[PDB]
Amino acid sequence: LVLEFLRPDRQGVTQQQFKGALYCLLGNHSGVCLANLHDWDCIVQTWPAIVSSGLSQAMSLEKPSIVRLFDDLAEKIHRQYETIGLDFTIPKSCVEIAELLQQSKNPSINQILLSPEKIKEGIKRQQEKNADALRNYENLVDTLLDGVEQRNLPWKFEHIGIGLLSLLLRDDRVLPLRAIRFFVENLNHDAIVVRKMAISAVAGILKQLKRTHKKLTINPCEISGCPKPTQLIAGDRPDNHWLHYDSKTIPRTKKEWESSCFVEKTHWGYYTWPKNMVVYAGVEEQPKLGRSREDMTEAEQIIFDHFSDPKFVEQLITFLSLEDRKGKDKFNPRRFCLFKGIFRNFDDAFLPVLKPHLEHLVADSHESTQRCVAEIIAGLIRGSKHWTFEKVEKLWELLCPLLRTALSNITVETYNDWGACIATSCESRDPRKLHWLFELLLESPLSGEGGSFVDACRLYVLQGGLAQQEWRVPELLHRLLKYLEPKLTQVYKNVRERIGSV
């Protein structure tokens, strides 16, 4: 009945009735929203209706109150939304306790034990309800998608619909393929607000489309050859030595790369070994990279086709390059998540298309162009975790020159963004795998070719990477101390402060 007032087809609805119905749908500050009701059946009716209210004819966006109500309805829905079921099966263990509760004397009403036929009926209804919930979820995505594509819908309503669609990312199921196409296509939508909403959604879609990686239980004592002391000794020990970064240890070969354990996370091994320790499976067991696109699933194919097309990438790079706020812009980790997902899922399939853009972005000294490349570089390095040795070596041959040019061009506006890129790339990774970058920033941080301030920025980016690898780089920290000790009395104030921090 409340939805009838905001129906677009209904005529003679009047401004007052439409405004009143929106207030009923908004709800009280405390109480039933009536538009965010948990049940899918209620949400499927309310969400499309709000989006299609734009064509109502009783809607005056020109009046300020109507816009405030629509913004409040969207804000309340976003703040009070919670994921809604989709599967409600109850485990057998719970039913056994329930049967005992039915069969309990004292405060007991005599009742027949549930018939086997009755128990079967309950299972059938629950299966129907869960199937019905899934049907509603797919319809809500389809109906909301129809609303946003309406020929004559005010822009505000399209924005409200795209936000509602973003709330429908599930985490238990991949998004309907039509929605995946809309979000990848809307990555380059003219509105920045829609573009940011698409970036967040596509990064989530990439996690849904991610293929699981196998893991192998390992004995830390066996690989080290150490006895693994019973007492809880903490810090560097004989058993933890392999994790430490050593120049001789770095694999630098295809055979050595396959042989090395590559533990990854920094915390493992410092205080005690976990009862079960997993080092990841061998490359052959792990999901095959470099698929031909015939193998890729339809959802993966949609992301692949758009990213592969040169024009789509060129537009995306230009939109990413544009400044949004002057002096308030930052790394934006959501952009890093999108790139890390693309590289991890597609194994550098789009690396040739992105290569011309990356070279140009590094050359340009503009703060915005440098920020965009930094996010891609951080995602490219992080996405390379499960890549084969041949692929990782190729990425580094391209990356080492571009990073050197970027560090040379580091400026007050972009110094923080470059520090974030190095820190994000270094975090959660084995130091031995990232040996190319560690050598790159440690070769001559205080070269002095850039000048003071540039030297301090280069020392700062190196400091961020060393901090991320904690205790797993006994060398490198020693090498930096040796490099810094002669220059301690030869540095200006900006460098001196950075030397003190490092």
Ligand X SMILES: O=P(O)(O)O[C@H]1[C@@H](OP(=O)(O)O)[C@@H](OP(=O)(O)O)[C@@H](OP(=O)(O)O)[C@@H](OP(=O)(O)O)[C@H]1OP(=O)(O)O
Q: Which residues bind other proteins (CB under 8 A)?
A: 54, 59-64, 67, 151-152, 154-156, 190-193, 319, 322-324, 326, 365-367, 409-413, 450-454, 492-495
Instruction: From residue 214, give the alpha-carbon distance in Å to each of 83, 279, 294.
Output: 29, 10, 24
Backbone angles phi, psi at 218, to 5 degrees: -130, 155
Q: Smaller CB distance to ligand X: residue 386 or 498?
A: 386
State in Å, rounded, how far the first CA of the chain is from the last one: 67
Q: Smaller CB distance to other proteins: residue 63 or 118?
A: 63
267 binds ligand X (CB under 6 A): no
Who's near 290: CB < 8 A, 6+ residues apart? 347, 349, 391
With contact defined as beta carbons under 8 Å apart, do 263 and 430 qualify? yes
Rounded to a whole number of angstroms, the minimum distance from the CB of residue 182 to other proteins is: 13
Q: Which does 170 bind (CB under 5 to 8 A by kind): other proteins, ligand X, none?
A: none
Alpha helices in 191-332 (DSSP H): 192-209, 220-224, 254-259, 298-308, 310-321
Q: Which does 156 bind (CB under 5 to 8 A by kind): other proteins, ligand X, none?
A: other proteins
Supply the Cα-derived Rg of the chain in whole angstroms.
29
* Alpha-carbon torsion angle 73, 76, 82, 85, nearest 10: -30
Q: Which of residues 99-128 bind ligand X (CB under 6 A)?
A: none
Q: Smaller CB distance to other proteins: residue 43 or 403?
A: 403
Q: Based on the number of CB atoms within 10 Å of its own CB, is 376 exposed (0-12), middle (13-18) or buried (19 or more)?
A: buried
Q: Smaller CB distance to ligand X: residue 25 or 426?
A: 426
Rounded to a whole number of angstroms, the minimum distance from the CB of residue 344 to ligand X is: 6
Q: Which amino acid is at 279?
A: V
User: Minimal CB distance to ligand X: which residue?
Assistant: 428
- Closest to 450 (Cα-Cα) out of 489, 409, 422: 409
Q: Based on the number of CB atoms within 10 Å of its own CB, is 152 exposed (0-12), middle (13-18) or buried (19 or more)?
A: exposed
Which sign, positive or negative, has the C-alpha torsion 365, 368, 372, 375?
A: positive
Q: Which does 453 bind (CB under 5 to 8 A by kind): other proteins, ligand X, none?
A: other proteins
Rounded to a whole number of angstroms, the minimum distance from the CB of residue 276 to ligand X is: 14
Alpha carbon 59 to its chain centroid, in Å, reads 38
Phi-psi region of 27 (alpha: psi -120 to 50; beta: other; left: phi over 0): left
Q: Which does 366 bind (CB under 5 to 8 A by kind): ligand X, other proteins, none?
A: other proteins
Count interface residues toward ligand X (CB under 6 A).
6
Rounded to a whole number of angstroms, the minimum distance from the CB of residue 450 to other proteins is: 6
> Near ligand X by CB under 6 A, which window of 66-74, 89-97, 100-108, 206-214?
206-214
382 binds ligand X (CB under 6 A): yes
Tell which one of 120, 173, 213, 254 touches ligand X (CB under 6 A).
Answer: 213
Rounded to a whole number of angstroms, the minimum distance from the CB of residue 453 to other proteins is: 6
Q: Smaller CB distance to ligand X: residue 74 or 299?
A: 299
Rounded to a whole number of angstroms, the minimum distance from the CB of residue 154 to other proteins is: 4
Q: Which does 365 bind (CB under 5 to 8 A by kind): ligand X, other proteins, none?
A: other proteins
Tell which one of 15, 428, 447, 501 touches ligand X (CB under 6 A).
Answer: 428
Rounded to a whole number of angstroms, the minimum distance from the CB of residue 298 to other proteins is: 15
Q: Which does 382 bind (CB under 5 to 8 A by kind): other proteins, ligand X, none?
A: ligand X
Rounded to a whole number of angstroms, the minimum distance from the CB of residue 150 to other proteins is: 12
Backbone angles phi, psi at 469, to 5 degrees: -85, 100
**Cα(183)–Cα(268) distance, integer angstroms:** 38
Q: Smaller CB distance to ligand X: residue 357 or 432?
A: 432
Instruction: From residue 204, give the alpha-carbon distance in Å to each of 117, 146, 405.
Output: 43, 22, 32
Binding stretches for ligand X (CB under 6 A): 207, 210, 213, 382, 385, 428
